[PDB]
């Protein structure tokens, strides 16, 4: 079980990742719980910053995005100059 | 090369499918062109009506959704009592 911190500088426009999941999308048959990184762009900030496809997003700038809805997660990622993500890689 | 017509009765609320692609999402690396069915619900109207995962949506009630944007396709599917889809299964 691994847990990593990703430092993505914000205000850089395109980030280079894609997310799925949420505490509401766990009903319509992801089968595991949580938000997950589904794509990392080759030249993406998230890819070079360490973020990998499959990483569950546990926290965003201190927030506990874990067990949050999909749109809650999108909002938590868009609103925050310094993007501090805590992600899981189990 | 196959082309099928799917008759989905509208005004039935949840349809039971999911779409991807578009004439604008062909840039950020689907690699083929067009809109595609990515999920068909087990009890879904689209599943029982014949729609399969992988089917490209060529037309919606006569429209040529082919080579259309993702949101153009969503709108073309949501706006129309009788949903007439022409889809490809190649």
């Amino acid at each position: 079980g691994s847990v990593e911190e990703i430092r993505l500088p914000r205000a850089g426009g395109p980030l280079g990742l894609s997310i799925v999941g949420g505490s509401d999308h766990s009903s319509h048959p992801v089968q595991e719980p949580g938000v997950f990184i589904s794509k990392v762009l080759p030249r993406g900030l998230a890819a070079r910053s360490g973020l990998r496809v499959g990483d569950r997003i546990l926290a965003v700038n201190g927030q506990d995005v874990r067990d949050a809805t999909h749109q809650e997660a999108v909002s938590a990622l868009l609103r925050p100059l310094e993007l501090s993500l805590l992600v899981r890689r189990d | 090369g196959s082309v099928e017509e799917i008759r989905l009765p509208r005004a039935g609320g949840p349809l039971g499918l999911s779409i991807v692609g578009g004439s604008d999402h062909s840039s950020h690396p689907v690699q083929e062109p067009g809109v595609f069915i990515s999920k068909v619900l087990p009890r879904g109207l689209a599943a029982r009506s014949g729609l399969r995962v992988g089917d490209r949506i060529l037309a919606v009630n006569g429209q040529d959704v082919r080579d259309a944007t993702h949101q153009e396709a969503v709108s073309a599917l949501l706006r129309p009592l009788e949903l007439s889809l022409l889809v490809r299964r190649d």
Partner: peptide, 8 residues
């Protein structure tokens, strides 16, 4: 009519 995947 529900975002199942969001790119950023």
């Amino acid at each position: 009519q529900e975002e199942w995947e969001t790119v950023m």
